[PDB]
Amino acid sequence: NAEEEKERQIASILSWEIDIIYKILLDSDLGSSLPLSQADFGLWFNHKGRHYFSGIAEVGHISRLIQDFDGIFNQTMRNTRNLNNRSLRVKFLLQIRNTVSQIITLLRELFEEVS
Amino acid sequence: NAEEEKERQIASILSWEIDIIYKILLDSDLGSSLPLSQADFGLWFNHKGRHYFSGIAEVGHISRLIQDFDGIFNQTMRNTRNLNNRSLRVKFLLQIRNTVSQIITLLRELFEEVSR
């Protein structure tokens, strides 16, 4: 059920993003949020996705985007005072949304390849 | 392909929500955003979903939540100055997120009911 799994994983990563967005909105912190590599999607991608798509370019590509955003996520964890600044808050919020948009596109391409 | 369609619709309504959230974040307005009834999910639900699930309780339930949130959406469209007030901005953002959460739950129930 590859296409069903694709849509499930897209829904998963969007829901992860939404929960982080609302923690920032309400509390100006990340709280008990997890980095993308430890989110349900990241766990799926590293345990099952990597091996179902083994030997395909876009796999490494998604991994690179996750690692880069983990860096940004962890910078914010260590200095959440950034979220009190309008410009830096917007910056973080755009970077999570745009990371997730790019990963979704690559995920669609990966599932296309196997079909 | 029922289960595939279910997950597709859940991904669709979450994506519609995110685009509205970021229009409010960046611009404190709704811009060219559409009400839920005219979003891709709302068009699917009204043109196909309602009738694929005709005679099931959760259909009317989802329609009720869409109609209520359309009301809130249009109140905001008519007075976006509300989005400049921190508490009223948070109120709207919670109401769209919580409307979508409840619809997703009901959609899961609908697809379960049709699988049985």
PDB file of C-alpha atoms in Angstrom:
ATOM      1  CA  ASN A   1       0.000   0.000   0.000  1.00  0.00           C
ATOM      2  CA  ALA A   2       2.714   2.448  -1.029  1.00  0.00           C
ATOM      3  CA  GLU A   3       0.515   5.432  -1.962  1.00  0.00           C
ATOM      4  CA  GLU A   4      -1.429   5.136   1.309  1.00  0.00           C
ATOM      5  CA  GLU A   5       1.880   5.064   3.206  1.00  0.00           C
ATOM      6  CA  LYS A   6       3.097   8.136   1.309  1.00  0.00           C
ATOM      7  CA  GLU A   7       0.073  10.169   2.341  1.00  0.00           C
ATOM      8  CA  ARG A   8       0.275   8.888   5.921  1.00  0.00           C
ATOM      9  CA  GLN A   9       3.897  10.058   6.175  1.00  0.00           C
ATOM     10  CA  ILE A  10       3.067  13.463   4.674  1.00  0.00           C
ATOM     11  CA  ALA A  11       0.233  13.854   7.203  1.00  0.00           C
ATOM     12  CA  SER A  12       2.671  12.788   9.956  1.00  0.00           C
ATOM     13  CA  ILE A  13       5.354  15.363   9.199  1.00  0.00           C
ATOM     14  CA  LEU A  14       2.769  18.166   8.767  1.00  0.00           C
ATOM     15  CA  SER A  15       1.277  17.321  12.192  1.00  0.00           C
ATOM     16  CA  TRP A  16       4.732  17.380  13.790  1.00  0.00           C
ATOM     17  CA  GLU A  17       5.311  20.856  12.310  1.00  0.00           C
ATOM     18  CA  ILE A  18       1.908  22.149  13.479  1.00  0.00           C
ATOM     19  CA  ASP A  19       2.562  21.105  17.064  1.00  0.00           C
ATOM     20  CA  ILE A  20       5.897  22.981  17.090  1.00  0.00           C
ATOM     21  CA  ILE A  21       4.284  26.058  15.517  1.00  0.00           C
ATOM     22  CA  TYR A  22       1.630  26.186  18.269  1.00  0.00           C
ATOM     23  CA  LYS A  23       4.180  25.718  21.076  1.00  0.00           C
ATOM     24  CA  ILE A  24       6.005  28.776  19.725  1.00  0.00           C
ATOM     25  CA  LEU A  25       2.737  30.732  19.327  1.00  0.00           C
ATOM     26  CA  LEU A  26       1.498  30.043  22.828  1.00  0.00           C
ATOM     27  CA  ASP A  27       4.668  29.783  24.887  1.00  0.00           C
ATOM     28  CA  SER A  28       7.576  31.175  22.825  1.00  0.00           C
ATOM     29  CA  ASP A  29       9.559  27.982  23.428  1.00  0.00           C
ATOM     30  CA  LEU A  30       9.865  24.484  21.971  1.00  0.00           C
ATOM     31  CA  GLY A  31       8.859  22.701  25.192  1.00  0.00           C
ATOM     32  CA  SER A  32       9.075  18.929  24.860  1.00  0.00           C
ATOM     33  CA  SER A  33       9.186  19.040  21.033  1.00  0.00           C
ATOM     34  CA  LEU A  34      11.504  16.546  19.325  1.00  0.00           C
ATOM     35  CA  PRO A  35      13.906  17.227  16.452  1.00  0.00           C
ATOM     36  CA  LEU A  36      12.789  15.937  13.046  1.00  0.00           C
ATOM     37  CA  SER A  37      15.183  12.963  13.219  1.00  0.00           C
ATOM     38  CA  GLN A  38      13.309  11.735  16.349  1.00  0.00           C
ATOM     39  CA  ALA A  39       9.801  12.683  15.173  1.00  0.00           C
ATOM     40  CA  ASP A  40       7.587   9.832  13.981  1.00  0.00           C
ATOM     41  CA  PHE A  41       8.528  10.678  10.405  1.00  0.00           C
ATOM     42  CA  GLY A  42      12.259  10.739  11.135  1.00  0.00           C
ATOM     43  CA  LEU A  43      12.057   7.389  12.902  1.00  0.00           C
ATOM     44  CA  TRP A  44      10.090   5.910   9.995  1.00  0.00           C
ATOM     45  CA  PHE A  45      12.495   7.328   7.436  1.00  0.00           C
ATOM     46  CA  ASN A  46      15.601   6.013   9.181  1.00  0.00           C
ATOM     47  CA  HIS A  47      14.256   2.560  10.121  1.00  0.00           C
ATOM     48  CA  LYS A  48      12.017   1.648   7.173  1.00  0.00           C
ATOM     49  CA  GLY A  49      12.083   4.368   4.517  1.00  0.00           C
ATOM     50  CA  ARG A  50      15.849   4.221   3.947  1.00  0.00           C
ATOM     51  CA  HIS A  51      15.695   0.497   3.267  1.00  0.00           C
ATOM     52  CA  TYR A  52      12.557   0.556   1.129  1.00  0.00           C
ATOM     53  CA  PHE A  53      14.148   3.235  -1.048  1.00  0.00           C
ATOM     54  CA  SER A  54      17.713   1.910  -0.792  1.00  0.00           C
ATOM     55  CA  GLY A  55      19.956   2.992  -3.657  1.00  0.00           C
ATOM     56  CA  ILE A  56      17.974   6.083  -4.647  1.00  0.00           C
ATOM     57  CA  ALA A  57      19.322   9.662  -4.745  1.00  0.00           C
ATOM     58  CA  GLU A  58      16.455  11.426  -2.963  1.00  0.00           C
ATOM     59  CA  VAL A  59      17.013   9.324   0.172  1.00  0.00           C
ATOM     60  CA  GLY A  60      20.347  10.980   0.836  1.00  0.00           C
ATOM     61  CA  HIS A  61      18.725  14.273  -0.040  1.00  0.00           C
ATOM     62  CA  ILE A  62      16.039  13.997   2.637  1.00  0.00           C
ATOM     63  CA  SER A  63      18.734  12.976   5.132  1.00  0.00           C
ATOM     64  CA  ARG A  64      20.703  16.153   4.383  1.00  0.00           C
ATOM     65  CA  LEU A  65      17.627  18.353   4.901  1.00  0.00           C
ATOM     66  CA  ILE A  66      16.822  16.650   8.208  1.00  0.00           C
ATOM     67  CA  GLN A  67      20.405  17.095   9.463  1.00  0.00           C
ATOM     68  CA  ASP A  68      20.457  20.777   8.518  1.00  0.00           C
ATOM     69  CA  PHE A  69      17.164  21.479  10.231  1.00  0.00           C
ATOM     70  CA  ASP A  70      18.208  19.458  13.331  1.00  0.00           C
ATOM     71  CA  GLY A  71      21.032  21.991  13.600  1.00  0.00           C
ATOM     72  CA  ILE A  72      18.645  24.926  13.471  1.00  0.00           C
ATOM     73  CA  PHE A  73      16.234  23.229  15.907  1.00  0.00           C
ATOM     74  CA  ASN A  74      19.024  22.617  18.395  1.00  0.00           C
ATOM     75  CA  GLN A  75      20.365  26.159  18.110  1.00  0.00           C
ATOM     76  CA  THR A  76      16.901  27.376  19.100  1.00  0.00           C
ATOM     77  CA  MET A  77      16.620  24.847  21.956  1.00  0.00           C
ATOM     78  CA  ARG A  78      19.834  26.283  23.360  1.00  0.00           C
ATOM     79  CA  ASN A  79      18.732  29.898  22.895  1.00  0.00           C
ATOM     80  CA  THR A  80      14.952  30.235  22.833  1.00  0.00           C
ATOM     81  CA  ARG A  81      15.271  33.953  23.557  1.00  0.00           C
ATOM     82  CA  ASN A  82      15.505  34.190  19.748  1.00  0.00           C
ATOM     83  CA  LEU A  83      11.773  33.394  19.637  1.00  0.00           C
ATOM     84  CA  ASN A  84      11.114  36.664  21.511  1.00  0.00           C
ATOM     85  CA  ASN A  85      12.453  38.639  18.550  1.00  0.00           C
ATOM     86  CA  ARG A  86       9.863  39.048  15.779  1.00  0.00           C
ATOM     87  CA  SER A  87      12.352  38.653  12.925  1.00  0.00           C
ATOM     88  CA  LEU A  88      14.145  35.635  14.423  1.00  0.00           C
ATOM     89  CA  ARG A  89      10.827  34.013  15.337  1.00  0.00           C
ATOM     90  CA  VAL A  90       9.610  34.404  11.752  1.00  0.00           C
ATOM     91  CA  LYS A  91      12.962  33.072  10.494  1.00  0.00           C
ATOM     92  CA  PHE A  92      12.647  29.873  12.515  1.00  0.00           C
ATOM     93  CA  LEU A  93       9.007  29.406  11.561  1.00  0.00           C
ATOM     94  CA  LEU A  94       9.803  29.792   7.847  1.00  0.00           C
ATOM     95  CA  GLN A  95      12.753  27.404   8.112  1.00  0.00           C
ATOM     96  CA  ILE A  96      10.662  24.601   9.651  1.00  0.00           C
ATOM     97  CA  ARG A  97       7.832  25.051   7.118  1.00  0.00           C
ATOM     98  CA  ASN A  98      10.195  25.255   4.154  1.00  0.00           C
ATOM     99  CA  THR A  99      12.216  22.226   5.319  1.00  0.00           C
ATOM    100  CA  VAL A 100       8.997  20.200   5.557  1.00  0.00           C
ATOM    101  CA  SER A 101       7.772  21.406   2.110  1.00  0.00           C
ATOM    102  CA  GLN A 102      11.036  20.319   0.476  1.00  0.00           C
ATOM    103  CA  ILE A 103      11.036  16.929   2.191  1.00  0.00           C
ATOM    104  CA  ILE A 104       7.412  16.312   1.114  1.00  0.00           C
ATOM    105  CA  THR A 105       8.357  16.991  -2.502  1.00  0.00           C
ATOM    106  CA  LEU A 106      11.300  14.582  -2.310  1.00  0.00           C
ATOM    107  CA  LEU A 107       9.120  11.971  -0.609  1.00  0.00           C
ATOM    108  CA  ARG A 108       6.616  12.210  -3.468  1.00  0.00           C
ATOM    109  CA  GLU A 109       9.429  11.679  -5.956  1.00  0.00           C
ATOM    110  CA  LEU A 110      10.733   8.630  -4.060  1.00  0.00           C
ATOM    111  CA  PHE A 111       7.345   6.916  -3.981  1.00  0.00           C
ATOM    112  CA  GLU A 112       6.921   7.727  -7.687  1.00  0.00           C
ATOM    113  CA  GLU A 113      10.176   5.943  -8.511  1.00  0.00           C
ATOM    114  CA  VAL A 114       9.127   2.668  -6.862  1.00  0.00           C
ATOM    115  CA  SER A 115       5.674   2.656  -8.488  1.00  0.00           C
TER     116      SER A 115
ATOM    117  CA  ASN B   1      -8.704   3.031  -2.695  1.00  0.00           C
ATOM    118  CA  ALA B   2     -10.418   4.130   0.520  1.00  0.00           C
ATOM    119  CA  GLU B   3      -7.562   4.148   3.027  1.00  0.00           C
ATOM    120  CA  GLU B   4      -5.310   5.989   0.582  1.00  0.00           C
ATOM    121  CA  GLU B   5      -8.013   8.619   0.029  1.00  0.00           C
ATOM    122  CA  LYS B   6      -8.442   9.018   3.799  1.00  0.00           C
ATOM    123  CA  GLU B   7      -4.770   9.813   4.339  1.00  0.00           C
ATOM    124  CA  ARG B   8      -4.746  12.081   1.272  1.00  0.00           C
ATOM    125  CA  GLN B   9      -7.632  14.117   2.689  1.00  0.00           C
ATOM    126  CA  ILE B  10      -5.978  14.375   6.121  1.00  0.00           C
ATOM    127  CA  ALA B  11      -2.755  15.623   4.505  1.00  0.00           C
ATOM    128  CA  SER B  12      -4.852  18.060   2.423  1.00  0.00           C
ATOM    129  CA  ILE B  13      -6.700  19.701   5.307  1.00  0.00           C
ATOM    130  CA  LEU B  14      -3.456  20.029   7.355  1.00  0.00           C
ATOM    131  CA  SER B  15      -1.799  21.777   4.405  1.00  0.00           C
ATOM    132  CA  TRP B  16      -4.726  24.190   4.028  1.00  0.00           C
ATOM    133  CA  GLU B  17      -4.420  25.036   7.749  1.00  0.00           C
ATOM    134  CA  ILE B  18      -0.671  25.660   7.552  1.00  0.00           C
ATOM    135  CA  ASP B  19      -1.070  28.101   4.670  1.00  0.00           C
ATOM    136  CA  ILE B  20      -3.590  30.153   6.664  1.00  0.00           C
ATOM    137  CA  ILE B  21      -1.402  30.061   9.785  1.00  0.00           C
ATOM    138  CA  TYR B  22       1.557  31.516   7.841  1.00  0.00           C
ATOM    139  CA  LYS B  23      -0.540  34.224   6.171  1.00  0.00           C
ATOM    140  CA  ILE B  24      -1.530  35.362   9.663  1.00  0.00           C
ATOM    141  CA  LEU B  25       2.052  35.106  10.962  1.00  0.00           C
ATOM    142  CA  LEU B  26       3.570  37.101   8.131  1.00  0.00           C
ATOM    143  CA  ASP B  27       0.859  39.569   7.171  1.00  0.00           C
ATOM    144  CA  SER B  28      -1.767  39.592   9.961  1.00  0.00           C
ATOM    145  CA  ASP B  29      -4.467  38.972   7.360  1.00  0.00           C
ATOM    146  CA  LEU B  30      -6.090  36.043   5.525  1.00  0.00           C
ATOM    147  CA  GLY B  31      -5.152  37.278   2.038  1.00  0.00           C
ATOM    148  CA  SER B  32      -6.550  35.018  -0.715  1.00  0.00           C
ATOM    149  CA  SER B  33      -7.248  32.156   1.716  1.00  0.00           C
ATOM    150  CA  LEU B  34     -10.450  30.197   1.161  1.00  0.00           C
ATOM    151  CA  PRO B  35     -12.984  29.072   3.783  1.00  0.00           C
ATOM    152  CA  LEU B  36     -12.909  25.390   4.671  1.00  0.00           C
ATOM    153  CA  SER B  37     -15.999  24.664   2.541  1.00  0.00           C
ATOM    154  CA  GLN B  38     -14.083  25.860  -0.562  1.00  0.00           C
ATOM    155  CA  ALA B  39     -10.710  24.354   0.390  1.00  0.00           C
ATOM    156  CA  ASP B  40      -9.711  21.207  -1.500  1.00  0.00           C
ATOM    157  CA  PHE B  41     -10.961  19.136   1.440  1.00  0.00           C
ATOM    158  CA  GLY B  42     -14.303  20.950   1.581  1.00  0.00           C
ATOM    159  CA  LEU B  43     -14.865  20.495  -2.149  1.00  0.00           C
ATOM    160  CA  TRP B  44     -14.028  16.809  -1.840  1.00  0.00           C
ATOM    161  CA  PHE B  45     -16.282  16.366   1.176  1.00  0.00           C
ATOM    162  CA  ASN B  46     -19.251  18.125  -0.418  1.00  0.00           C
ATOM    163  CA  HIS B  47     -18.910  16.758  -3.970  1.00  0.00           C
ATOM    164  CA  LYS B  48     -17.837  13.196  -3.167  1.00  0.00           C
ATOM    165  CA  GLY B  49     -17.411  12.403   0.528  1.00  0.00           C
ATOM    166  CA  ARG B  50     -20.958  13.214   1.674  1.00  0.00           C
ATOM    167  CA  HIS B  51     -22.416  10.857  -0.887  1.00  0.00           C
ATOM    168  CA  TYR B  52     -19.836   8.093  -0.526  1.00  0.00           C
ATOM    169  CA  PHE B  53     -20.828   8.051   3.150  1.00  0.00           C
ATOM    170  CA  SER B  54     -24.538   8.843   2.727  1.00  0.00           C
ATOM    171  CA  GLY B  55     -26.580   7.709   5.721  1.00  0.00           C
ATOM    172  CA  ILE B  56     -23.770   7.868   8.279  1.00  0.00           C
ATOM    173  CA  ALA B  57     -23.948  10.071  11.391  1.00  0.00           C
ATOM    174  CA  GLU B  58     -20.420  11.477  11.157  1.00  0.00           C
ATOM    175  CA  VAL B  59     -21.187  13.123   7.807  1.00  0.00           C
ATOM    176  CA  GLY B  60     -23.643  15.586   9.307  1.00  0.00           C
ATOM    177  CA  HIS B  61     -21.206  16.068  12.158  1.00  0.00           C
ATOM    178  CA  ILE B  62     -18.363  17.137   9.858  1.00  0.00           C
ATOM    179  CA  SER B  63     -20.769  19.438   7.974  1.00  0.00           C
ATOM    180  CA  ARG B  64     -21.706  21.121  11.257  1.00  0.00           C
ATOM    181  CA  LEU B  65     -18.040  21.778  12.175  1.00  0.00           C
ATOM    182  CA  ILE B  66     -17.298  23.170   8.713  1.00  0.00           C
ATOM    183  CA  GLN B  67     -20.314  25.512   8.854  1.00  0.00           C
ATOM    184  CA  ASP B  68     -19.346  26.768  12.325  1.00  0.00           C
ATOM    185  CA  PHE B  69     -15.765  27.417  11.325  1.00  0.00           C
ATOM    186  CA  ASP B  70     -16.838  29.130   8.059  1.00  0.00           C
ATOM    187  CA  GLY B  71     -18.676  31.567  10.334  1.00  0.00           C
ATOM    188  CA  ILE B  72     -15.530  32.286  12.361  1.00  0.00           C
ATOM    189  CA  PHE B  73     -13.421  32.566   9.171  1.00  0.00           C
ATOM    190  CA  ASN B  74     -15.810  35.074   7.661  1.00  0.00           C
ATOM    191  CA  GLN B  75     -16.021  37.124  10.863  1.00  0.00           C
ATOM    192  CA  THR B  76     -12.256  37.457  10.639  1.00  0.00           C
ATOM    193  CA  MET B  77     -12.333  38.274   6.899  1.00  0.00           C
ATOM    194  CA  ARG B  78     -14.679  41.156   7.673  1.00  0.00           C
ATOM    195  CA  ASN B  79     -12.568  42.400  10.570  1.00  0.00           C
ATOM    196  CA  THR B  80      -8.935  41.367  10.296  1.00  0.00           C
ATOM    197  CA  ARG B  81      -7.947  44.046  12.820  1.00  0.00           C
ATOM    198  CA  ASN B  82      -8.710  41.293  15.348  1.00  0.00           C
ATOM    199  CA  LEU B  83      -5.504  39.579  14.198  1.00  0.00           C
ATOM    200  CA  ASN B  84      -3.543  42.578  15.542  1.00  0.00           C
ATOM    201  CA  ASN B  85      -4.693  41.766  19.068  1.00  0.00           C
ATOM    202  CA  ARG B  86      -2.594  39.019  20.650  1.00  0.00           C
ATOM    203  CA  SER B  87      -5.475  37.260  22.435  1.00  0.00           C
ATOM    204  CA  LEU B  88      -7.882  37.422  19.471  1.00  0.00           C
ATOM    205  CA  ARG B  89      -5.135  36.239  17.125  1.00  0.00           C
ATOM    206  CA  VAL B  90      -4.422  33.246  19.388  1.00  0.00           C
ATOM    207  CA  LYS B  91      -8.174  32.591  19.632  1.00  0.00           C
ATOM    208  CA  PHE B  92      -8.541  32.341  15.854  1.00  0.00           C
ATOM    209  CA  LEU B  93      -5.433  30.208  15.465  1.00  0.00           C
ATOM    210  CA  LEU B  94      -6.634  27.766  18.128  1.00  0.00           C
ATOM    211  CA  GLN B  95     -10.082  27.573  16.558  1.00  0.00           C
ATOM    212  CA  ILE B  96      -8.747  26.643  13.131  1.00  0.00           C
ATOM    213  CA  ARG B  97      -6.340  24.031  14.576  1.00  0.00           C
ATOM    214  CA  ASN B  98      -8.970  22.523  16.852  1.00  0.00           C
ATOM    215  CA  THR B  99     -11.635  22.482  14.098  1.00  0.00           C
ATOM    216  CA  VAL B 100      -9.221  20.579  11.872  1.00  0.00           C
ATOM    217  CA  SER B 101      -8.255  18.115  14.678  1.00  0.00           C
ATOM    218  CA  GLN B 102     -11.917  17.277  15.289  1.00  0.00           C
ATOM    219  CA  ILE B 103     -12.686  16.862  11.597  1.00  0.00           C
ATOM    220  CA  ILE B 104      -9.706  14.514  11.176  1.00  0.00           C
ATOM    221  CA  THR B 105     -10.999  12.351  14.016  1.00  0.00           C
ATOM    222  CA  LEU B 106     -14.478  12.211  12.491  1.00  0.00           C
ATOM    223  CA  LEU B 107     -13.061  11.420   9.066  1.00  0.00           C
ATOM    224  CA  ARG B 108     -11.184   8.453  10.528  1.00  0.00           C
ATOM    225  CA  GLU B 109     -14.460   7.247  12.054  1.00  0.00           C
ATOM    226  CA  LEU B 110     -16.302   7.649   8.724  1.00  0.00           C
ATOM    227  CA  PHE B 111     -13.755   5.575   6.828  1.00  0.00           C
ATOM    228  CA  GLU B 112     -13.882   2.948   9.581  1.00  0.00           C
ATOM    229  CA  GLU B 113     -17.665   2.805   9.297  1.00  0.00           C
ATOM    230  CA  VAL B 114     -17.446   2.303   5.529  1.00  0.00           C
ATOM    231  CA  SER B 115     -14.792  -0.413   5.892  1.00  0.00           C
ATOM    232  CA  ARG B 116     -17.154  -2.419   8.099  1.00  0.00           C
TER     233      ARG B 116
END
